[PDB]
Amino acid sequence: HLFTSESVSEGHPDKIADQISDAVLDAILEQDPKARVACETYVKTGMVLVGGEITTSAWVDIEEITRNTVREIGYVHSDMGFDANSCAVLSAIGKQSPDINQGVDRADPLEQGAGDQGLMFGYATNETDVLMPAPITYAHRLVQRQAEVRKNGTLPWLRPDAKSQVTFQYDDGKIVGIDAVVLSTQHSEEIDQKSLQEAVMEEIIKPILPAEWLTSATKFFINPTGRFVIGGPMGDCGLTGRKIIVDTYGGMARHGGGAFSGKDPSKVDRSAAYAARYVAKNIVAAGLADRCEIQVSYAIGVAEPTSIMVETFGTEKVPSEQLTLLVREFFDLRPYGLIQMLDLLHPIYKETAAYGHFGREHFPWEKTDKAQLLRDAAG
Amino acid sequence: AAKDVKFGNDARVKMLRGVNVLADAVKVTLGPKGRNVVLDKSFGAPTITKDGVSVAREIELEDKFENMGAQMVKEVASKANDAAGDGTTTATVLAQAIITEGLKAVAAGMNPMDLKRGIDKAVTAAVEELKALSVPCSDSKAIAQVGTISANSDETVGKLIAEAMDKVGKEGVITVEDGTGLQDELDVVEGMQFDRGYLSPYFINKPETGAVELESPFILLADKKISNIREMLPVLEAVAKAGKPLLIIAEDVEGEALATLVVNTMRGIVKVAAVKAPGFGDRRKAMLQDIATLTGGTVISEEIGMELEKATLEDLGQAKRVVINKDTTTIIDGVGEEAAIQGRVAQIRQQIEEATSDYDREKLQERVAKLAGGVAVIKVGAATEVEMKEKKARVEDALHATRAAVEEGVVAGGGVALIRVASKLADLRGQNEDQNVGIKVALRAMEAPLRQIVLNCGEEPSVVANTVKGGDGNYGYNAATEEYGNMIDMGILDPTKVTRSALQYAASVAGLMITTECMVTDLP
Amino acid sequence: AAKDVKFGNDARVKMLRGVNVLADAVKVTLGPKGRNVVLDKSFGAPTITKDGVSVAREIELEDKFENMGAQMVKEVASKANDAAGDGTTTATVLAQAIITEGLKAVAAGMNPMDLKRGIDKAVTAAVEELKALSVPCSDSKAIAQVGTISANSDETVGKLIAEAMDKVGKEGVITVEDGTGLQDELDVVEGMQFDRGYLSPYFINKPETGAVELESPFILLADKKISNIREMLPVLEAVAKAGKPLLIIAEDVEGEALATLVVNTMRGIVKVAAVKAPGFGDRRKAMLQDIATLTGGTVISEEIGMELEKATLEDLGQAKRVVINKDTTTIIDGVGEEAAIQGRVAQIRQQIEEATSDYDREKLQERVAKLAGGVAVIKVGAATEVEMKEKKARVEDALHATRAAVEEGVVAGGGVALIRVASKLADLRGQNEDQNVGIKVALRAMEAPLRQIVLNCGEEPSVVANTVKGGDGNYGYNAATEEYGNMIDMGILDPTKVTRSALQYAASVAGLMITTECMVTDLP
Amino acid sequence: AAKDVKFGNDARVKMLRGVNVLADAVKVTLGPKGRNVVLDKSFGAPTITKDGVSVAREIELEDKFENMGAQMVKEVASKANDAAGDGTTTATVLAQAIITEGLKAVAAGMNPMDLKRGIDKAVTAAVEELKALSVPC
Ligand SMILES: Nc1ncnc2c1ncn2[C@@H]1O[C@H](COP(=O)(O)OP(=O)(O)O)[C@@H](O)[C@H]1O
Ligand SMILES: Nc1ncnc2c1ncn2[C@@H]1O[C@H](COP(=O)(O)OP(=O)(O)O)[C@@H](O)[C@H]1O
Ligand code: BEF
Ligand code: BEF
Ligand code: BEF
Ligand SMILES: [K+]
Ligand SMILES: [K+]
Ligand SMILES: [K+]
Ligand SMILES: [Mg+2]
Ligand SMILES: [Mg+2]
């Protein structure tokens, strides 16, 4: 079947807002090991707004973090209508919470209860080496390539705003080729249109997509309307958490819709999804299945998870009862237990803000160290 | 998902209905008196076209089996476009005629295999008959006539294409881009040039034209980035000891070397110019090697263990003149050895074959033309964008037709060559009766294009076809003048390759499409 | 998605219905008696407008075929607005009339291609006839009359534009901007001015205007960013002994350097001011070189190989006065050589004719006007926002019409020039009967605008058109006063460029739309 | 969520209908001359099985009360599978017969608890009788 996945670059206002929220979270976590963070960001033309509820014993000024973060993308000029230093950032964050002494008492951290009700999902397939759906993975790699080239200085007239669309066809459930590649990017006005598409296809499209998957039927689309000079926060409204589907899987996996950016690890809306991906990746790397998903359910005010379900699409080499048995006795699905074994309480959420929360080997939740043990047990 | 299965005559009727819908959509644009088709596009204004392939690429139907038939027929036009560039409407008409007659024969109670074998045998004989009928096309008059006929009887574009082809030659590239004026203009480039200009505005010694001209200069080729002058002290001092200028072709030179270069040029010690290396990636090194071969010099690459410090006059090429402006750099009359030129063009020509994308074929053909030959561009002119697209499509069709006619030859146009072939193949026979029936089907359906051409003019196709069959040789019918005469004398020429490809693809698709027994598709 | 295909008369009827809907929406705003059209806007309040292109840009129908017809017609108005900036309703009316008569002829049984050829031939003859009829427009009275006519008969805006064009000169820039008061205001700038102000608020010495006022100062031009004071000592000491002030133009100066400059200005050692270099990129350097040429100085650039410590009093320019505000800086009576200025503007204009983009040219004419001439801003005054928008649109239309009239010339307005041209071509003939029919169609459709104007006035168009056609020369009908007379005497002037563009674009679109046979679009 | 409550004979007849559906599905695979049952699978090909537990694990009814009855009886087959490995169909047949006769007795106007006591006593005696009848193998 024909399926399309779309990815966006770091220069987009929503991605800018997501990067700001995660940058603050890392700064707060570095200063406060056990802080509570629930933040949101809004960006518009020349005005930047931040809000939410963050309860911590330390203080951080948001101005220097925002200027440092925005400068990283490359908004250091007024030509696109947004400059790092000329802009203004205001704070609308309540730094204190009434419940700081009433609930300070704790009985046992190992028996902490879930603060939200809902069910979360994971996903992993052996189609790619990174154990991820191909169309979303290659879409992220394309915009990642554009930023690396832009930062390298070989292509100085490129702009942070960029969007890519990749189309994949499946024959009998396997990848047989690439159909259409679209890369929408903003460029400077000095370079004409004809020279623009030549540089992008030969240095971004060519050395990223596999050569053996490209046939004569592949169609390359660059700048459909013909002029993408207009861009930045001026051309679109900016807010936090609107394309969670793009960040997680691109639509190939059912998702709960919970926002990721700007949330502390304490909330299960973010960390429990990370553990589900970690479990799903581990259970598929051992070769027990071709594809697998983990359905973990939690209830607000309830410690023990209500139900854990595993579905395989009939590709399992062992009965599903064995699959469920292994995850229960080898993975600690406790809301605090998964925190300790995934050691997420470190300032590592800045890089996760852009280019997808999943699909990178260096992430703690993307390790496959437990794959070998499960293969021996199920074998 | 669930599937729906239809057996026999029902599936055949649905398939024929889809084929008829697509063919009736396409057929209205055939001949000199055909009409245009408006294509709806959600992203902007509708596009009006007369191309058969453009109409066929857009048609799909609500019903599943009719959609099957339409999609199966679409490949005839698609392959005719990809192979020859013309004959898409003729191929579609021939395929429809084969399908109709073959379905009638199958409904008469005959097995499809024998009909398909007979059709294949008849087409195999017809290809050789067409090859026998062909005549070479060498003079510019015939090329102009072919270009005129291929562009809806537009003499200006045919004459322009003939003149451009004569100027460029046989080993060259002609391309069409949309212009800005109200009338078409032709621009030809002699020698080689690349879209790279001078780095700094202080190099121009002739401000009247805004371009710098170097007489008998050197050429220095480098692939490494330049930020310090220390690596060019020997070469610059050596060429300043001689006096005649030097040119630097590097991928990029930073401002530190620009400062010393410009101050040396201004102070009147050594006259140098700098241009960036054109292109990017492996193509950049390939064209750098091409420049090295043509200018009689040697490239300097760091990765091959060659350093610029040890370079001398033997590693620098020569040229008669060099003209550099804000956007282009031209090397005039290089002093390279010829056999290297033939070797390089042969290497690129043989590398063309293994390329799978026509974009790479275009790039390597452009490289061959740049290294040897000339390059010409045709800037079509129209007042409105829609007319711009229409004229551009017509000019591209004329270019393809002229190229094919030069490659293989021309035959009498108006659909009379196929009639002559069918009349000469009247004694073909097969193994059994059904093969003979298939041969008769093919021979009878070879007459479709002329009948459709006459029908588009509003006359009676039967009497015109009967009159044409009574003649011999190149006798035919002129649809523009509504009178008979010698097709060659009146200038109605058709390439042999286009007719052969259209016949082959139409027969190949229709023979398989006839044999269908049942269809399997998803439920609505 | 599944498509819908309609053939022949049904498609033509749907297309004509869409064309009629759009043309009826647009044509109610033609002439001096034309009324307004209100366009709904989702964000904000709807806008009262009288422009043909503004109304045409919004129309889109529910039915797919009529929508395609409307989208094809809309390009006439779009192109007419983009090319000349005026005369879009006339183009739409002409296109509708040509389409109607061509569809009638096609339904009568004629060949669409020959009709299109005849239309093109007639329009080609009409263009040269119009070029023959044109007369020059140079005096200020004719420019004022053109501006008055093009602005819905408003004397004040015409007089304002005439006097602004007289004051600025022949090569200048005039723009419109929202005003504050209830009356129009013209602001003309003398000298050179760039949109950049003082860096530090402590240079101000005249709080009466909140600005600095330097009398006969030196101008220091440095391309590089100034971050250390060490390079500043030599030229600062040199200018300290002279006693005259000094101004610094650099890309950016850090506050460490500003501190000592502010201290020196306070203590009265040197009267210095610092402003940023306007622009960014190559244009920044180009117009800073233009500043150096105007002021008679030399740019101290690191790229050329010249250092700031070695600067002397010869490298500093001079001017009569320099005024810097919070946002603007003006150089009054820059001392320089006239021949150098003429050479620079000659170089800039010869770059101008090589500009292939509209956006890349206006900056070039702005630079030309900045070096030689001046710029003007016209402020429109209105109590309410909607009235402000409508008045600004009318003023822009008048400005474009005056520019076109000065560029090419004027002809008698009111739609009588087209009538005279059509009366001159009464003997034009084609190659066959169909081309003659097309020529007659074009000639008869050339009289639509006058009939539409008279119909909008509320009279019988037929008798007025018959009376006008019975005269000769500039005889016409005055729609405002409802009386016949000499068009030039009454001051009803239309530029030749807008009439020619409207006719050409209307014919180019209508002739192509005539030859449609079938239309394919998505299902509802 | 809102609940539905049924009292007495209606609940009992719904339960018996569910039990009868499950038992009729299962018991056609008993003995040397019993036939097979085709079980549909969402991902893959249908499986043909003669097991009692395999058929019982897939029976889920539309009505809620009959579904409750079927789920209650499925425990017999599940426990017989997990305990000895055989005797699933025989256990299901015995459970259905006991349920039917006990429901008839209850509808006759008898105390269900004492019927449960009598059934337990009879089965306790029968286990000892079976132990006495056993022969070494
Ligand atoms: N003046 C003419 N008289 C008779 N036949 C013509 C004349 N001009 C063109 N033809 C024939 O009509 C055909 C035109 O086909 P065309 O509409 O270009 O579709 P395609 O070339 O895509 O198949 C040509 O094959 C040519 O032989
Ligand atoms: N007082 C007048 N008497 C007769 N004709 C006039 C008079 N004023 C304007 N006209 C004509 O009416 C036309 C006005 O067109 P207008 O409504 O401005 O639309 P557009 O300029 O966009 O075509 C002009 O072409 C002009 O020739
Ligand atoms: F319609 Be074909 F491409 F000439
Ligand atoms: F309607 Be036009 F722009 F005067
Ligand atoms: F029915 Be049992 F599994 F033999
Ligand atoms: K055609
Ligand atoms: K108007
Ligand atoms: K059994
Ligand atoms: Mg053709
Ligand atoms: Mg007007």
Numbering used by the authors:
A (entry chain 1): 4 to 382
B (entry chain C), C (entry chain B): 2 to 525
D (entry chain E): 2 to 138
Question: Which sentences from the paper describe this structure?
Answer:
The bacterial chaperonin GroEL cooperates with its cofactor GroES in assisting the folding of roughly 10% of newly synthesized proteins, including proteins with α/β topology that fail to fold spontaneously. GroEL is a cylindrical complex of around 800 kDa containing two heptameric rings of 57 kDa subunits stacked back to back. The apical domains mediate substrate protein (SP) binding and the equatorial domains mediate ATP binding and hydrolysis.
To validate this finding we solved as a reference the structure of stably encapsulated MetK, an obligate GroEL substrate, in vitro. Encapsulation occurred following the addition of GroES and ATP-BeFx. Alignment and classification showed that around 40% of GroEL–GroES units contained density for an ordered MetK molecule close to the equatorial region of the chamber. The substructure of the ordered MetK molecules was solved at a resolution of approximately 3.7 Å, showing side-chain density in its hydrophobic core. The encapsulated MetK was native-like, with a root mean squared deviation relative to the crystal structure (PDB 7LOO42) of 1.4 Å for 366 of the 379 Cα atoms. The main difference was in the conformation of residues 97–111, the so-called core loop. This region packs against bound S-adenosylmethionine and an adjacent subunit in the MetK tetramer, but in the encapsulated MetK subunit adopted a more extended conformation that was not well resolved. The core loop apparently remains unstructured until tetramer assembly following release from chaperonin. The encapsulated MetK makes multiple contacts with the GroEL cavity wall, contacting two subunits at Phe44 in the equatorial GroEL domain as well as five subunits at Phe281 and three at Tyr360, both protruding from the apical GroEL domains. Of note, the GroEL cavity wall does not contact the interface regions of the MetK subunit that become buried following assembly.
